[PDB]
Amino acid sequence: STPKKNISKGAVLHEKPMTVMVLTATEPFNYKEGKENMFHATVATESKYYRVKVFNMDLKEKFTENQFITISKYFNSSGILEINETATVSEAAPNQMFEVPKNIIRSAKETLKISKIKELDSGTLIYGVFAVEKKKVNDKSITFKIKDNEDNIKVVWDKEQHNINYEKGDKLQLFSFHLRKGNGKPILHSGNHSFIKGE
Amino acid sequence: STPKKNISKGAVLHEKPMTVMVLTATEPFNYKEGKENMFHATVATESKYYRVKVFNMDLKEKFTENQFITISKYFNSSGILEINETATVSEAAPNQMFEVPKNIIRSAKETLKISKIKELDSGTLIYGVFAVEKKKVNDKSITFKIKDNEDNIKVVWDKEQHNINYEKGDKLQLFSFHLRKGNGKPILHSGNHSFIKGE
DNA sequence: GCGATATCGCT
DNA sequence: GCGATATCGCTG
DNA sequence: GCGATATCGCT
DNA sequence: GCGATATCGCT
DNA sequence: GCGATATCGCTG
DNA sequence: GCGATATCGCT
């Protein structure tokens, strides 16, 4: 539809094919409100793991746990792969397949300590699974609090009301949330691509 | 709506107010088919006369024979004033009014000889009043021929079917037509802003 | 077999 | 085909 | 856009 | 008297 | 506010 | 866009 369409500001295009194994992917959902579906994915190589944002819905079938794929003309914004109709995505050839270390996989399912998160620069993109607290409904928002035990952080959802909690004691899983500090006590804020659900 | 909106490629913006008397103006009509009304006007100063294209319909009332106006932030493309919502157009102050020579006025109602027209570079914009010949209807066009007596030139209308002829022996008046030469015998071709009517 | 249209190139 | 003009997307 | 040449199409 | 929203600046 | 990306408008 | 501060508004 357009070369950089749906791509983040300043993302760098990556030329050469890279082959990865899919760990994880979410349902497509909706943003830029009402237009623009996308979905979230985690993939790995032998060396490292990447978080992915997928703007071309045709790719949804290629993204399934443990499936190997080859990507080219994708975009990297600050370490997060972004992918749209401009990229080519193939089912990988066996010769291109490889082993993926337990470490890497452990490492890519792993969630930071709220303590450690708070030492991070403003605007940092946060992902993780968290225990939850009392929510709220506000004319135009929703409010959480989540526990690492050793915190303690508030979470602000600015988007819209659909999803599933989940009868509270269900835990809470976060994609692409924005760290905000300022003068106040810091919080995690919803963003373009933000996604929450029960784990 | 947009600074250069409806303005011709490479038109230069004119900063300082200029004061002119309206000789002539046409009804608004329609182009870029179905969108984009505009209208044609002839105006003069003491020194010279200009052909004008007016894309802001609010200006229609300001343009009436013999009325003096002040224009600023208008555009000149190859000697043809172009005017849109970006320009300012005021009813002129009497101190700004002036005399307009018979010569200039004669000169701006005046039509070239088809002979002399044909020595002109391709793509030149032609205006004039002309005697007419047998027409045609073609699936997607209309064809004329017009006489200066000493020519002899064909005319091609690519636009659409509304206007008034006029029971042939009515004469024919042309705004902003394109001279086309090439290998063939030359012709006058309809364009974006082209307009024909009976005089 | 001519004129009316469609394609090219870049304007 | 390609530069000019308008809209999009939010550092270091 | 638009002008020029290349092709279409009635007959 | 706090949190939820609206505005600013430029990102 | 402003540079980057996409669409607009057709020399010399 | 988005983060930060400035203002709104229930009570």
CSV table of C-alpha atoms (C1' of nucleotides) in Angstrom, one decimal:
chain,number,residue,atom,x,y,z
A,1,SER,CA,0.0,0.0,0.0
A,2,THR,CA,3.0,2.2,0.7
A,3,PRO,CA,6.7,1.3,1.3
A,4,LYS,CA,7.0,2.6,4.8
A,5,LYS,CA,3.4,2.2,5.5
A,6,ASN,CA,2.7,1.6,9.2
A,7,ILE,CA,6.4,1.6,9.9
A,8,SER,CA,7.9,3.5,12.9
A,9,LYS,CA,9.8,6.8,12.5
A,10,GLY,CA,13.5,6.2,11.7
A,11,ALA,CA,13.2,2.4,11.4
A,12,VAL,CA,16.1,1.1,9.2
A,13,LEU,CA,15.3,-1.2,6.3
A,14,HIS,CA,17.0,-4.5,6.3
A,15,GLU,CA,18.1,-5.8,2.9
A,16,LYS,CA,19.4,-9.4,3.3
A,17,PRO,CA,17.1,-12.3,4.2
A,18,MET,CA,17.3,-13.5,7.8
A,19,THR,CA,15.9,-16.8,9.0
A,20,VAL,CA,14.2,-17.1,12.3
A,21,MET,CA,12.0,-19.4,14.3
A,22,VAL,CA,8.6,-18.2,15.5
A,23,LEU,CA,8.1,-18.5,19.3
A,24,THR,CA,5.0,-16.5,19.7
A,25,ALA,CA,2.2,-14.6,18.0
A,26,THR,CA,-1.1,-12.8,19.0
A,27,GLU,CA,-4.4,-12.2,17.3
A,28,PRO,CA,-4.4,-9.3,14.9
A,29,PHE,CA,-6.6,-6.7,16.6
A,30,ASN,CA,-7.0,-3.0,15.7
A,31,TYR,CA,-5.5,0.5,16.2
A,32,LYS,CA,-5.1,4.0,14.7
A,33,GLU,CA,-8.5,3.5,15.9
A,34,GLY,CA,-10.7,1.4,13.7
A,35,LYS,CA,-8.2,1.2,10.8
A,36,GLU,CA,-4.9,-0.5,10.7
A,37,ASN,CA,-4.8,-4.1,12.0
A,38,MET,CA,-1.4,-5.5,13.1
A,39,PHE,CA,-0.2,-8.2,15.4
A,40,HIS,CA,2.5,-9.0,17.8
A,41,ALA,CA,5.1,-11.8,17.5
A,42,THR,CA,8.3,-13.1,19.2
A,43,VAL,CA,10.9,-14.8,17.0
A,44,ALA,CA,14.4,-16.1,17.6
A,45,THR,CA,17.7,-17.0,15.9
A,46,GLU,CA,20.6,-19.1,17.3
A,47,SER,CA,22.2,-15.9,18.5
A,48,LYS,CA,19.3,-13.7,19.8
A,49,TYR,CA,15.6,-13.0,20.0
A,50,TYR,CA,13.5,-10.2,18.5
A,51,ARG,CA,10.1,-8.7,19.2
A,52,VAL,CA,8.1,-8.2,16.0
A,53,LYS,CA,5.2,-6.1,14.9
A,54,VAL,CA,3.3,-7.4,11.8
A,55,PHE,CA,1.2,-5.1,9.7
A,56,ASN,CA,0.4,-7.4,6.9
A,57,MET,CA,-2.3,-9.8,7.8
A,58,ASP,CA,-1.5,-12.3,5.1
A,59,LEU,CA,1.5,-13.2,7.3
A,60,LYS,CA,-0.6,-14.5,10.2
A,61,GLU,CA,-0.5,-18.1,8.9
A,62,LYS,CA,3.3,-18.1,8.6
A,63,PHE,CA,3.5,-17.1,12.3
A,64,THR,CA,3.1,-20.2,14.4
A,65,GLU,CA,5.0,-21.6,17.2
A,66,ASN,CA,8.2,-23.3,16.1
A,67,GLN,CA,7.8,-22.5,12.5
A,68,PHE,CA,11.0,-21.3,10.7
A,69,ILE,CA,10.7,-18.4,8.3
A,70,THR,CA,12.9,-16.2,6.1
A,71,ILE,CA,12.4,-12.5,6.2
A,72,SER,CA,13.8,-9.7,3.9
A,73,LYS,CA,13.0,-6.0,3.4
A,74,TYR,CA,11.9,-5.8,7.0
A,75,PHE,CA,12.5,-2.9,9.3
A,76,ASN,CA,14.4,-2.6,12.6
A,77,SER,CA,13.4,0.2,14.9
A,78,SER,CA,15.6,0.2,18.0
A,79,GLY,CA,15.8,-3.5,18.0
A,80,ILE,CA,12.2,-4.3,17.3
A,81,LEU,CA,11.5,-5.9,13.9
A,82,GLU,CA,8.7,-4.3,11.9
A,83,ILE,CA,7.1,-6.0,8.9
A,84,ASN,CA,4.7,-4.9,6.3
A,85,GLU,CA,3.6,-5.6,2.7
A,86,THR,CA,7.1,-4.4,1.6
A,87,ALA,CA,8.8,-7.3,3.2
A,88,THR,CA,9.1,-10.8,1.7
A,89,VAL,CA,8.3,-13.7,4.1
A,90,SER,CA,9.0,-17.3,3.1
A,91,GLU,CA,8.6,-20.6,4.8
A,92,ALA,CA,12.3,-21.3,5.5
A,93,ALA,CA,14.3,-24.0,3.7
A,94,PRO,CA,15.5,-26.9,6.0
A,95,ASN,CA,19.1,-26.0,5.1
A,96,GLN,CA,18.4,-22.6,6.6
A,97,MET,CA,16.9,-24.1,9.8
A,98,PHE,CA,18.9,-24.4,13.0
A,99,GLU,CA,18.9,-25.2,16.7
A,100,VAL,CA,17.6,-22.6,19.2
A,101,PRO,CA,19.2,-22.5,22.7
A,102,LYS,CA,17.1,-22.9,25.9
A,103,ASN,CA,18.7,-19.7,27.1
A,104,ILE,CA,17.4,-17.6,24.2
A,105,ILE,CA,13.9,-19.1,24.5
A,106,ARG,CA,13.9,-18.7,28.3
A,107,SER,CA,15.2,-15.2,27.8
A,108,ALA,CA,12.5,-14.2,25.4
A,109,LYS,CA,9.6,-15.4,27.6
A,110,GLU,CA,11.2,-13.6,30.5
A,111,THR,CA,9.7,-10.5,32.3
A,112,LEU,CA,11.7,-7.7,34.0
A,113,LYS,CA,11.5,-6.6,37.6
A,114,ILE,CA,9.4,-3.5,38.1
A,115,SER,CA,12.3,-2.2,40.2
A,116,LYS,CA,14.7,-2.7,37.2
A,117,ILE,CA,12.2,-1.3,34.7
A,118,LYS,CA,12.0,2.0,36.5
A,119,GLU,CA,15.7,2.8,36.0
A,120,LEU,CA,14.9,2.8,32.2
A,121,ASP,CA,14.8,5.9,30.0
A,122,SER,CA,11.4,7.5,29.3
A,123,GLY,CA,9.6,6.3,26.3
A,124,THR,CA,11.2,2.8,26.5
A,125,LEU,CA,8.9,0.1,25.1
A,126,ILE,CA,7.9,-2.4,27.8
A,127,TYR,CA,6.7,-6.0,27.5
A,128,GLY,CA,6.0,-8.5,30.3
A,129,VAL,CA,3.6,-10.6,32.2
A,130,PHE,CA,2.4,-9.2,35.6
A,131,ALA,CA,0.2,-9.8,38.6
A,132,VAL,CA,-2.6,-7.3,38.8
A,133,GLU,CA,-4.5,-5.0,41.2
A,134,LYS,CA,-7.7,-3.0,41.4
A,135,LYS,CA,-8.7,-1.5,38.1
A,136,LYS,CA,-10.8,1.6,37.3
A,137,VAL,CA,-13.1,3.0,34.6
A,138,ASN,CA,-12.5,6.6,33.8
A,139,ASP,CA,-14.5,8.5,31.3
A,140,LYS,CA,-11.8,8.1,28.7
A,141,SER,CA,-9.3,5.6,30.2
A,142,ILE,CA,-8.7,2.6,32.4
A,143,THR,CA,-6.2,2.3,35.3
A,144,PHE,CA,-4.3,-0.7,36.7
A,145,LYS,CA,-1.6,-1.4,39.1
A,146,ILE,CA,0.7,-4.4,38.8
A,147,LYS,CA,3.0,-6.2,41.1
A,148,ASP,CA,6.5,-7.6,40.7
A,149,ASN,CA,6.6,-7.6,44.5
A,150,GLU,CA,9.2,-4.9,44.8
A,151,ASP,CA,6.6,-3.0,42.9
A,152,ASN,CA,4.2,-1.3,42.4
A,153,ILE,CA,3.7,0.4,39.1
A,154,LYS,CA,0.6,2.0,37.7
A,155,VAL,CA,-0.6,1.4,34.2
A,156,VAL,CA,-2.7,3.6,32.0
A,157,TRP,CA,-4.9,2.4,29.1
A,158,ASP,CA,-6.0,5.2,26.8
A,159,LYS,CA,-7.5,3.1,24.0
A,160,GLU,CA,-10.9,1.6,24.1
A,161,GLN,CA,-13.0,-1.1,25.9
A,162,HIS,CA,-13.2,-4.7,24.6
A,163,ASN,CA,-10.8,-7.2,26.0
A,164,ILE,CA,-10.7,-9.9,28.6
A,165,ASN,CA,-10.1,-9.7,32.3
A,166,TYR,CA,-10.6,-12.3,33.5
A,167,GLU,CA,-12.1,-12.4,36.8
A,168,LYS,CA,-9.2,-10.6,38.4
A,169,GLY,CA,-6.9,-13.3,39.7
A,170,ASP,CA,-5.9,-13.9,36.1
A,171,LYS,CA,-2.4,-12.4,35.5
A,172,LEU,CA,-1.7,-9.7,33.0
A,173,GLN,CA,0.5,-9.7,29.8
A,174,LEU,CA,1.8,-6.5,28.1
A,175,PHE,CA,3.0,-5.7,24.6
A,176,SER,CA,4.7,-2.5,23.6
A,177,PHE,CA,3.8,-0.2,26.5
A,178,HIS,CA,5.4,3.2,27.1
A,179,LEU,CA,7.5,4.0,30.1
A,180,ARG,CA,6.7,7.5,31.4
A,181,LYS,CA,8.7,9.2,34.1
A,182,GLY,CA,8.5,12.9,34.5
A,183,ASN,CA,8.2,14.6,37.9
A,184,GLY,CA,5.5,12.3,39.1
A,185,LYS,CA,5.7,8.7,40.1
A,186,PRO,CA,6.4,6.9,36.8
A,187,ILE,CA,3.8,4.9,35.0
A,188,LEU,CA,3.4,2.6,31.9
A,189,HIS,CA,1.3,4.1,29.2
A,190,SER,CA,-0.7,2.7,26.3
A,191,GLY,CA,0.6,3.5,22.8
A,192,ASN,CA,-0.2,3.1,19.2
A,193,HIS,CA,0.6,-0.6,19.2
A,194,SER,CA,-0.1,-1.4,22.8
A,195,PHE,CA,-1.8,-4.7,23.6
A,196,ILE,CA,-2.9,-6.3,27.0
A,197,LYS,CA,-4.5,-9.6,27.6
A,198,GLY,CA,-4.8,-12.4,30.3
A,199,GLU,CA,-2.1,-15.0,30.4
B,1,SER,CA,-7.4,24.6,1.1
B,2,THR,CA,-3.7,24.5,0.1
B,3,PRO,CA,-1.2,27.2,-0.7
B,4,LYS,CA,-0.5,26.2,-4.3
B,5,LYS,CA,-3.8,24.5,-4.7
B,6,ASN,CA,-5.0,24.6,-8.3
B,7,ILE,CA,-2.0,26.6,-9.3
B,8,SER,CA,0.1,25.8,-12.5
B,9,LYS,CA,3.5,24.1,-12.3
B,10,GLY,CA,6.3,26.6,-11.7
B,11,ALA,CA,4.0,29.6,-11.3
B,12,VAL,CA,5.8,32.4,-9.4
B,13,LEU,CA,4.2,33.9,-6.3
B,14,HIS,CA,3.7,37.7,-6.4
B,15,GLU,CA,4.2,39.4,-3.1
B,16,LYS,CA,3.3,43.1,-3.5
B,17,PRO,CA,-0.3,44.2,-4.1
B,18,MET,CA,-1.1,45.2,-7.7
B,19,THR,CA,-4.2,47.2,-8.7
B,20,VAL,CA,-6.0,46.4,-11.9
B,21,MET,CA,-9.3,47.1,-13.6
B,22,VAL,CA,-11.5,44.2,-14.6
B,23,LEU,CA,-12.4,44.1,-18.3
B,24,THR,CA,-13.9,40.6,-18.5
B,25,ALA,CA,-15.1,37.5,-16.7
B,26,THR,CA,-16.9,34.3,-17.4
B,27,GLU,CA,-19.1,32.0,-15.5
B,28,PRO,CA,-17.3,29.6,-13.1
B,29,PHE,CA,-17.9,26.1,-14.7
B,30,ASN,CA,-16.1,22.9,-14.0
B,31,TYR,CA,-13.0,20.8,-14.6
B,32,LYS,CA,-10.6,18.1,-13.3
B,33,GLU,CA,-13.7,16.6,-14.2
B,34,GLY,CA,-16.6,17.3,-11.7
B,35,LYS,CA,-14.4,18.8,-9.0
B,36,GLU,CA,-12.6,22.1,-9.2
B,37,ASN,CA,-14.6,25.1,-10.4
B,38,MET,CA,-12.6,28.1,-11.7
B,39,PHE,CA,-13.3,31.0,-14.1
B,40,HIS,CA,-11.7,33.2,-16.7
B,41,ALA,CA,-11.0,36.9,-16.5
B,42,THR,CA,-9.3,39.6,-18.3
B,43,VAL,CA,-7.9,42.6,-16.4
B,44,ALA,CA,-5.7,45.6,-17.2
B,45,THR,CA,-3.4,48.2,-15.7
B,46,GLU,CA,-2.2,51.5,-17.3
B,47,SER,CA,0.8,49.7,-18.7
B,48,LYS,CA,-0.5,46.3,-19.8
B,49,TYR,CA,-3.3,43.6,-19.7
B,50,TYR,CA,-3.3,40.1,-18.2
B,51,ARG,CA,-5.4,37.0,-18.6
B,52,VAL,CA,-6.5,35.6,-15.3
B,53,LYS,CA,-7.6,32.2,-14.0
B,54,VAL,CA,-9.7,32.4,-10.8
B,55,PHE,CA,-10.0,29.3,-8.6
B,56,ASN,CA,-11.7,30.9,-5.6
B,57,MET,CA,-15.4,31.3,-6.3
B,58,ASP,CA,-15.8,34.0,-3.6
B,59,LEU,CA,-14.0,36.3,-6.0
B,60,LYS,CA,-16.7,36.1,-8.7
B,61,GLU,CA,-18.5,39.2,-7.3
B,62,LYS,CA,-15.3,41.3,-7.3
B,63,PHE,CA,-14.9,40.6,-11.0
B,64,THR,CA,-17.2,42.8,-13.0
B,65,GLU,CA,-16.5,45.0,-16.0
B,66,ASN,CA,-14.8,48.2,-15.1
B,67,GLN,CA,-14.4,47.4,-11.4
B,68,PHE,CA,-10.9,48.2,-9.9
B,69,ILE,CA,-9.4,45.7,-7.5
B,70,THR,CA,-6.2,45.1,-5.6
B,71,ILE,CA,-4.5,41.7,-5.8
B,72,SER,CA,-1.7,40.3,-3.6
B,73,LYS,CA,-0.2,36.8,-3.2
B,74,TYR,CA,-1.3,35.9,-6.6
B,75,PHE,CA,0.7,33.7,-9.1
B,76,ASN,CA,2.1,34.5,-12.5
B,77,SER,CA,2.6,31.5,-14.8
B,78,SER,CA,4.2,32.6,-18.1
B,79,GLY,CA,2.3,35.9,-18.0
B,80,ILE,CA,-1.0,34.5,-17.0
B,81,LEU,CA,-2.2,35.6,-13.5
B,82,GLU,CA,-3.5,32.7,-11.4
B,83,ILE,CA,-5.5,33.3,-8.2
B,84,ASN,CA,-6.7,31.1,-5.4
B,85,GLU,CA,-7.7,31.3,-1.7
B,86,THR,CA,-4.1,32.1,-0.9
B,87,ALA,CA,-4.4,35.5,-2.6
B,88,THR,CA,-6.0,38.6,-1.0
B,89,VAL,CA,-8.4,40.5,-3.3
B,90,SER,CA,-9.8,43.9,-2.3
B,91,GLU,CA,-12.0,46.5,-3.9
B,92,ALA,CA,-9.4,49.1,-4.8
B,93,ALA,CA,-9.1,52.5,-3.1
B,94,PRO,CA,-9.9,55.4,-5.4
B,95,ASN,CA,-6.4,56.8,-4.9
B,96,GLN,CA,-5.2,53.5,-6.4
B,97,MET,CA,-7.5,53.8,-9.4
B,98,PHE,CA,-6.2,55.1,-12.8
B,99,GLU,CA,-7.0,55.6,-16.5
B,100,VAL,CA,-6.8,52.7,-18.9
B,101,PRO,CA,-5.7,53.5,-22.5
B,102,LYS,CA,-8.0,52.6,-25.5
B,103,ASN,CA,-4.9,50.8,-26.9
B,104,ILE,CA,-4.6,48.3,-24.0
B,105,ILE,CA,-8.3,47.6,-24.0
B,106,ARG,CA,-8.4,47.2,-27.8
B,107,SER,CA,-5.3,45.0,-27.5
B,108,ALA,CA,-6.9,42.7,-24.8
B,109,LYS,CA,-10.1,42.1,-26.8
B,110,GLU,CA,-8.0,41.4,-29.9
B,111,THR,CA,-7.7,38.0,-31.6
B,112,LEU,CA,-4.6,36.7,-33.5
B,113,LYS,CA,-4.5,35.6,-37.2
B,114,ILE,CA,-4.5,31.8,-37.5
B,115,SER,CA,-1.5,32.3,-39.8
B,116,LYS,CA,0.4,34.1,-37.1
B,117,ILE,CA,-0.7,31.6,-34.4
B,118,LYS,CA,0.8,28.7,-36.3
B,119,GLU,CA,4.3,30.2,-36.1
B,120,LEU,CA,4.0,29.8,-32.3
B,121,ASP,CA,5.8,27.2,-30.1
B,122,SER,CA,3.9,24.0,-29.2
B,123,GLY,CA,2.0,24.1,-26.0
B,124,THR,CA,1.3,27.8,-26.2
B,125,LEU,CA,-2.0,28.9,-24.6
B,126,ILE,CA,-4.4,30.4,-27.2
B,127,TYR,CA,-7.3,32.7,-26.7
B,128,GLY,CA,-9.4,34.3,-29.4
B,129,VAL,CA,-12.8,34.7,-31.1
B,130,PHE,CA,-13.3,32.8,-34.3
B,131,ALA,CA,-15.7,32.0,-37.1
B,132,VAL,CA,-16.6,28.3,-37.2
B,133,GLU,CA,-17.1,25.4,-39.4
B,134,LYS,CA,-18.7,21.9,-39.5
B,135,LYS,CA,-18.5,20.1,-36.1
B,136,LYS,CA,-18.4,16.5,-35.2
B,137,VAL,CA,-19.3,14.1,-32.5
B,138,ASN,CA,-16.8,11.4,-31.7
B,139,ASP,CA,-17.2,8.8,-29.1
B,140,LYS,CA,-15.0,10.7,-26.7
B,141,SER,CA,-14.4,14.1,-28.4
B,142,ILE,CA,-15.7,16.9,-30.5
B,143,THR,CA,-14.1,18.4,-33.6
B,144,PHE,CA,-14.2,21.9,-35.1
B,145,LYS,CA,-12.6,24.0,-37.7
B,146,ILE,CA,-12.3,27.7,-37.5
B,147,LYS,CA,-11.5,30.5,-40.0
B,148,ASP,CA,-9.4,33.6,-39.8
B,149,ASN,CA,-9.6,33.6,-43.6
B,150,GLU,CA,-6.0,32.8,-44.2
B,151,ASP,CA,-6.9,29.8,-42.1
B,152,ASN,CA,-7.9,27.0,-41.4
B,153,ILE,CA,-7.2,25.4,-38.1
B,154,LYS,CA,-8.8,22.3,-36.6
B,155,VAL,CA,-9.8,22.3,-33.0
B,156,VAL,CA,-10.2,19.4,-30.6
B,157,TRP,CA,-12.4,19.3,-27.6
B,158,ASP,CA,-11.6,16.4,-25.2
B,159,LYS,CA,-13.8,17.3,-22.3
B,160,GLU,CA,-17.5,16.7,-22.1
B,161,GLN,CA,-20.8,17.8,-23.6
B,162,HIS,CA,-22.9,20.7,-22.3
B,163,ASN,CA,-22.4,24.0,-23.8
B,164,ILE,CA,-24.0,26.2,-26.4
B,165,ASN,CA,-23.7,26.3,-30.1
B,166,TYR,CA,-25.6,28.2,-31.2
B,167,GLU,CA,-27.2,27.4,-34.3
B,168,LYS,CA,-23.9,27.5,-36.2
B,169,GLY,CA,-23.6,31.0,-37.6
B,170,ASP,CA,-22.8,32.1,-34.1
B,171,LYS,CA,-19.0,32.8,-33.8
B,172,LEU,CA,-16.7,31.0,-31.4
B,173,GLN,CA,-14.7,32.3,-28.5
B,174,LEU,CA,-11.7,30.4,-26.9
B,175,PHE,CA,-10.0,30.5,-23.5
B,176,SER,CA,-6.7,28.7,-22.8
B,177,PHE,CA,-6.4,26.3,-25.6
B,178,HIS,CA,-3.3,24.4,-26.4
B,179,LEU,CA,-1.4,24.8,-29.6
B,180,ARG,CA,-0.1,21.4,-30.9
B,181,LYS,CA,2.2,21.0,-33.8
B,182,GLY,CA,4.1,17.8,-34.3
B,183,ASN,CA,4.5,16.1,-37.6
B,184,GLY,CA,0.9,16.5,-38.6
B,185,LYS,CA,-1.0,19.6,-39.5
B,186,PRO,CA,-1.2,21.6,-36.3
B,187,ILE,CA,-4.3,21.9,-34.2
B,188,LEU,CA,-5.7,23.6,-31.0
B,189,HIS,CA,-6.3,21.2,-28.2
B,190,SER,CA,-8.5,21.4,-25.1
B,191,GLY,CA,-6.7,21.5,-21.8
B,192,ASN,CA,-7.4,21.5,-18.1
B,193,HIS,CA,-8.7,25.1,-18.0
B,194,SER,CA,-10.1,25.2,-21.6
B,195,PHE,CA,-13.3,27.0,-22.2
B,196,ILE,CA,-15.4,27.6,-25.4
B,197,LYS,CA,-18.7,29.5,-25.8
B,198,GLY,CA,-20.6,31.6,-28.4
B,199,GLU,CA,-19.8,35.2,-28.7
C,1,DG,C1',-6.6,5.7,-45.2
C,2,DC,C1',-8.4,9.0,-42.4
C,3,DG,C1',-9.5,10.5,-38.2
C,4,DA,C1',-10.1,9.1,-33.3
C,5,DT,C1',-8.0,6.9,-29.6
C,6,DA,C1',-4.2,4.8,-26.7
C,7,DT,C1',0.3,4.5,-25.3
C,8,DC,C1',5.0,6.7,-24.1
C,9,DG,C1',8.0,9.5,-21.6
C,10,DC,C1',8.9,13.0,-18.7
C,11,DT,C1',7.6,17.0,-19.1
D,1,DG,C1',10.0,9.7,-14.6
D,2,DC,C1',10.8,12.9,-11.6
D,3,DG,C1',11.0,17.4,-8.8
D,4,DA,C1',7.8,20.2,-6.2
D,5,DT,C1',4.3,20.4,-2.9
D,6,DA,C1',1.5,18.4,0.7
D,7,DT,C1',0.8,15.2,4.4
D,8,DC,C1',2.6,12.0,7.8
D,9,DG,C1',5.0,10.8,12.3
D,10,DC,C1',6.8,11.8,15.7
D,11,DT,C1',15.6,12.4,17.7
D,12,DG,C1',19.5,13.0,19.8
E,1,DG,C1',-0.3,17.0,-17.5
E,2,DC,C1',0.4,17.1,-21.9
E,3,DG,C1',2.4,16.7,-26.4
E,4,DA,C1',4.0,13.6,-29.6
E,5,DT,C1',4.0,9.2,-32.1
E,6,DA,C1',1.9,4.6,-32.3
E,7,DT,C1',-2.1,1.9,-32.9
E,8,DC,C1',-7.2,1.2,-33.4
E,9,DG,C1',-11.2,1.0,-36.2
E,10,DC,C1',-15.0,2.3,-39.2
E,11,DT,C1',-16.3,1.2,-44.1
F,1,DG,C1',-6.1,17.3,46.6
F,2,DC,C1',-6.1,13.5,43.8
F,3,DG,C1',-6.4,11.5,39.6
F,4,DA,C1',-8.1,12.2,34.9
F,5,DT,C1',-7.9,15.1,31.1
F,6,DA,C1',-6.2,18.9,28.0
F,7,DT,C1',-2.7,21.7,26.2
F,8,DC,C1',2.3,22.4,24.6
F,9,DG,C1',6.2,21.7,21.8
F,10,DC,C1',8.7,19.2,18.7
F,11,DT,C1',9.8,15.1,19.1
G,1,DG,C1',7.4,22.4,14.6
G,2,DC,C1',9.6,20.2,11.5
G,3,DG,C1',12.1,16.5,8.6
G,4,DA,C1',10.7,12.3,6.2
G,5,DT,C1',7.6,10.1,3.2
G,6,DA,C1',4.0,10.1,-0.2
G,7,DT,C1',1.4,12.3,-3.7
G,8,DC,C1',0.8,15.8,-7.2
G,9,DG,C1',1.8,18.1,-11.8
G,10,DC,C1',3.5,18.2,-15.4
G,11,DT,C1',11.0,22.5,-18.0
G,12,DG,C1',14.4,24.1,-20.4
H,1,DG,C1',3.1,10.7,18.2
H,2,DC,C1',4.1,11.1,22.5
H,3,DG,C1',5.9,12.6,26.9
H,4,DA,C1',5.7,16.2,29.9
H,5,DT,C1',3.5,19.9,32.5
H,6,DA,C1',-0.7,22.6,33.1
H,7,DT,C1',-5.5,22.7,34.0
H,8,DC,C1',-10.1,20.4,34.9
H,9,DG,C1',-13.3,18.5,38.1
H,10,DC,C1',-15.5,15.3,41.3
H,11,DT,C1',-16.8,15.6,46.3
